[PDB]
Design a protein around this ligand. Structure first.
Ligand SMILES: [Zn+2]
Ligand SMILES: [Zn+2]
Ligand SMILES: [Zn+2]
Length: 70
């Protein structure tokens, strides 16, 4: 249902300003790759570590969920 990926400080992840509900939101690289963000305002970057928001309706717009957590 909600991605259980976690990553550390020096691990890349994705922000998407089109899909996020808060600037602190982020999704893991595989969730980004398996979703649809063309023409979105997204950036690969470091986030200080985190837990993936893919699948969480409180953190991420449903249209931005990957195929595996939709
Ligand atoms: Zn997006
Ligand atoms: Zn994920
Ligand atoms: Zn996902």
């Amino acid at each position: 249902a909600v991605c259980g990926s976690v990553w550390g400080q020096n691990d890349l992840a994705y922000r998407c300003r089109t899909c996020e509900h808060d600037p602190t939101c982020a999704i893991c690289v595989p969730c980004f790759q398996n979703g649809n963000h063309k023409d979105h305002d997204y950036s690969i970057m470091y986030t200080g570590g985190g837990c993936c928001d893919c699948g969480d309706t409180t953190a991420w717009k449903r249209e931005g969920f990957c195929s595996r957590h939709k």
